RNA sequence: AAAAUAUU
RNA sequence: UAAAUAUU
């Protein structure tokens, strides 16, 4: 049981550029290189300058997907993606190195 | 005891899947240049009483050998599954059986064209992407969000005939 | 734009017939299956009550294969007269497939009032163990279907050209190697279906009495064995027999010799060059001179085959047969004579003896000893 | 296991839990972040008021409903279903 | 690394968890003939014997070592035993799967012709196996094709 | 003595459209069993220096004659429209030209299948409607709403190759 | 009366009775003087074919020599071409039977442009002269429709 | 034209749902049932079953057919949807459209 | 000519008129049915009241907008856009 | 597993080569068109710098036709060397189409340094006026050299553009008859004419000659109409005797025999009356005369008429044949100044030169007429 | 027989 | 010089 205020946060705070805040476990963000490097151990909050709220929601869902199925290699399920969101999702992934 | 054996993992497949595999591999070995460099041994080129063929795929200095078998008593009551497949990875005397999904991952690592490193930058600048992945079976694991987004925005190629996929060959159709 | 697949033609064009039915045992690019058929009632040989041509693709779906289409049609067309005995004759470019053979077996077992004869231009996947088992279960077995299978000869090709081709004011012109291909296919199919002689034929021919009469043929029975771990293992697949093809205007003008037919079929076994094989032959008459010369040449070229000839009698003419035997032996062949043991083995393996025992004829041992002495003298002189 | 997202007043938490876990366990889990007693903290589903004691099975929700690629959405309140942003 | 791969991985679709397998040969034949010829083949060592997991498509096929040809050196002992228990057959088969060496162990009851099987790790074969080939395979399997073409 | 002429109506078409018509007419005359009874005359079976073919479609007493034509100088600058088509309605002495749409409505009076009298009922009863119209050019006019609704409920048959139609033969392409 | 009513109140043949611009098409590619000379010669001799097309449609009128048709067709009405009424115009008169109704197509072409105008008019003379049964047969063929007729 | 007189320019058509449209007499003449119904003293029509939307669609068909009763050049399409096709078919059958 | 639709108080009238016809002519046409003076009556389009003096071209409507299969829709007022029925 | 239409190969299978290039003048179901091409600098007798095969359906779109695809590839390949002149050789099963012929004309008129030779197994739609006009514009106008394929070209294609292994070319049954029929039809289409020297040599009525070992035949037809004769401008041409050849005809056919072989193709109406006028350097021999007599008896409609420049009498049987010819109705005459001039102006590319009569033309004509006249009645 | 996309 | 859906 980790408290976000403490060093061993166990739930890093993400602030969407749009204005929405999510929170996700430390390892889930560790799967993303930029946040991994940023989190430095004395900080527990990351703010995004350009990523929309929906983009950050989808990348968090992707973190969940990857951590759930990083080791699994059997009958992987589908991960929704749409053309209208695809370009900005690619940009966000490049920024976060997903 | 006192009678030795050799032990192999044999995916029980249908005969129609086997010849479809044979047709596709030869097609891309002769009609198209895609599978050029692959070898295909006929049934009479191996002493094994059961081996029906052998597709050899050079992977750099190692090799990937896909074998089919005939006359196995394992055929279902309706003979839905009389024949079988096995994937091997041989390097000199060393050898190891391989899973169909990892087999295609190792295949696509060398032979079929795929999104180059420039794909990300070209998509960022809104430019047309080429070359692009055409063998969807080489990325059947959980790929990086990058690749999933790229595959979403720009569709993969659909070759005709489809490239030989080891996963499609050994997919459990009767058990679904 | 492009019309739909046509599968019920009435007759096929001359180029089509010449292309599809070319009976080379190993033909590629013939991705289509043609099935001419005739249906008639039991009684005096009369005009067929129906006859058409079904067409299909080898890589299509089984329900569309020509054979399954015919059986689907028959299952309905038969309902008109449930008390009618039906003889069906197929002339097909490719032998039915494994699944279709099994389905035909089930169909024919279900219907006990149908007699199916099949003539095949070529054998389709004749080297597949599963297909061989399916053919054996369909034809070889004397129960249920008793479907008969045969290779197409000049007569059947001519019948098709007359009745299943738009052959207008023209006569059938056989392609080059029709007889050789026919005999190769016949030997292979007999090897598959495990054909065996009737007892009377073996009793009549394989008599070792030195003085004989009225026997114008030569019979050859062959088996093969493989070398492994200093042991000879019988290739149960390689086992059969054959008889000389007498001269015929349509077939071989100068009838081919059984030895030459055997040497023509050996190459199709695709024996390994790096292994060692032993081929054992039992012949009713000793090789002639030309045969023996060829056989010696063949043995010289093929270093992986060790030949073992056995003979029930010696056929000698001009003394040149003795020369032929001398050159054959010098080539490396092992020539011997058939004794009680060999006669019994041939009876057990190559005859439809119905479990019966061997009944040696009179003077067998004395004749065997005399012929052994004769062969010893011939090889030593 | 099922992954779930809780949303309220432009705040969110992504967290995994078991199937047999009851709503009491959910409030206990969110206690680690919200720093408020769980007895009062109130959950909502489909604009419906969940009772203080509420188990997954009697709720009817299943692992099919809540997926990593489509987690179930539930609101939170103390003592406004805010839609996501748009392109 | 091999032990870690065998321990903390989803393995080949044939998990180390014990699973029920069955003998599939002679599917059609009456039961008595099936079991009789099973015992005969197990005693002989001249034919092939196959064990298929009930719920999947994977199966283990034992071929006589003479069929393949040139014998492969076996630092580990594989066997089919009919002696430890009267009414059951023990099966031990070493293998290399996805680069990690394992031993597939199992047993089949003669009366039922179906039994159980499990997959155990093998450290012994690991150190003796060549480092060059195993390192090459480890390098080859970790890589991916995306964004590597220059 | 002044010259004498015969006056006819010709529709400028492309040689490719004439070819396809020929193909369709032949096909459905021989390969199929639909257009049986259609008579076709080759280019050497008529003395006219320009005629290319004549398709006769007996309609009871009357006869519909569709003719194509060769070597008309009227061809366009790019020779988009060198050839020509015509339709005539011969009965005894009398003859007359006809419109392409009226010509398909005339041929579809006796030749290709259409909703039967009882076809409407099955729409309400939920049964299967048969026969269904396979030639949609024979109803090019505005018909009763019952037929339109029935056609909307059940899609028309699409035959391959399409039934030959005078409309599709003599439709405008250059400028519409 | 029915024929006249149809002509007056029908969408007529796709070739409306209203005046329409027509032009001569032969020898498009050749220069204008050659085209003019060839058109005049074709009109005079009566040996070649001459075709007049509306500008905006694919319909055109072909004047084949009556000899090509083989058996000369009886002509109760006269078809004619004037090269005499005006020096610079060529006039045409073509009796035809379009969609079951007999009409006269009239028109003029200026030879310099080899173009001009044409119109359709109802033909009263031959309507009663033509056979009776055939006209009603064509009218019934034009009225019936396959829909819901077969039993 | 005046609606007070029985020979009005249009005719009342009350829908089963309880909705009234009005359509020209000449347009209605295209249907046998209404043609026989319109009797010259009456100028109203009551439909037991036709829904309001079905009535609107059938009236649209009358308008289309009267507009293109004679013309046969570049005839426009008549959109029809399966969800309404069956009830429109029943309405046409009743009205002989 | 174009066929027009008027939509008010559970009534509708079907009539063909010239494009150049002004709203005054439309009111004259509907007077034959409504038995009311043209002056006070006001039309509506896209839930927008139409002035006493207006023309089709000024409104921007064209013969393409009003078709024999999809006529232009306009409401009416005297001194509620009722939707069609449903299956 | 239905690969896309393979429109290019390197060599074709023997069965394909035999089934497609079989050159019957009226052949059906050869829906594909094959085109084996070679390119080479104007320097002769050196290995070609490129040679391949393009194939395509007839009923496809014009851009997929083998000719258009070859020109599309050639336009790009030509930019490599703009200073080099090229010769291109085609061997095509079906003859190009009208559109393809026109567009090839345009393409080659664009390029002033590319020569094109074409060989055809069969003529595609050889009885369509526009195709005839298109070929006339493409070939004769002056460079596209359209020819028919003979034994030599067939053997060349078999050797170079087929996978045949240790195999020798085996001509089908009627190869020479079909070749000569196609040659005659192509000559009729293109409107070939004799060179002045050839006619001057081969049409001397002078009884004493040297080297007269070849027989010519210049034909034309006339149709009945309104009790009048109308020239069928299609039916005009000439031909010469084919010498015996080992691969061609073992016993060379006589020009008259080729004429009788081609006449049936014209599909002359059985209910129409036709007059066939012929001019020949030598009078028909006995076998030719018998064949003409039997053919004319068989054909009611045809009416043959023969004009000759010399009377070929040998062993006296020819005069006997003339009697049966006359009984059949074939009128035989001699060539006078008027007919000599007509042949010169009609069947020679005289370039507008007027006929120049030789010495003793009238006297020789009178002598031949005197020799011929008595035989028939006397 | 083939007048030729009659898709054998 | 076909081991065969390498659909020329
Ligand atoms: Zn890829
Ligand atoms: Zn089959
Ligand atoms: Zn012999
Ligand atoms: Zn219809
Ligand atoms: Zn072309
Ligand atoms: Zn001669």
Residue numbers in the entry:
A (entry chain E): 8 to 46, 54 to 112
B (entry chain B), F (entry chain G): 1 to 176
C (entry chain A): 1 to 381
D (entry chain D), I (entry chain I): 2 to 80, 89 to 96
E (entry chain C): 7 to 156
G (entry chain H): 6 to 156
H (entry chain J): 9 to 46, 54 to 112
J (entry chain F): 1 to 142, 146 to 381
Report text from the authors:
APOBEC3G (A3G), in particular, is a powerful restriction factor of retroviruses that blocks viral replication by hypermutation of viral complementary DNA and inhibition of reverse transcription. The lentiviral protein Vif inhibits A3G packaging into virions by targeting it for ubiquitin-mediated proteolysis, and through ubiquitin-independent mechanisms that are poorly understood. To target A3 family members for ubiquitination and degradation, Vif hijacks a host Cullin-RING ubiquitin ligase (CRL) complex and a transcription cofactor core-binding factor beta (CBFβ). Here, we solved the structure of wild-type human A3G bound to the substrate receptor module of CRL5 containing HIV-1 Vif, CBFβ, Elongin B and Elongin C (VCBC) using single-particle cryo-EM.
Two-dimensional (2D) classification indicates that the complex is a dimer of A3G–VCBC protomers. Second, in addition to RNA binding, A3G self-association is required for its packaging into virions. Our structure indicates that Vif binding to A3G is mutually exclusive due to its ability to self-associate. Whereas A3G–VCBC forms dimers, within each dimeric assembly A3G forms little or no self-association. Nucleotides that are 3′ to the primary Vif–A3G interaction site may template an additional copy of the Vif E3 ligase to cooperatively reinforce Vif–A3G interactions and ubiquitination.
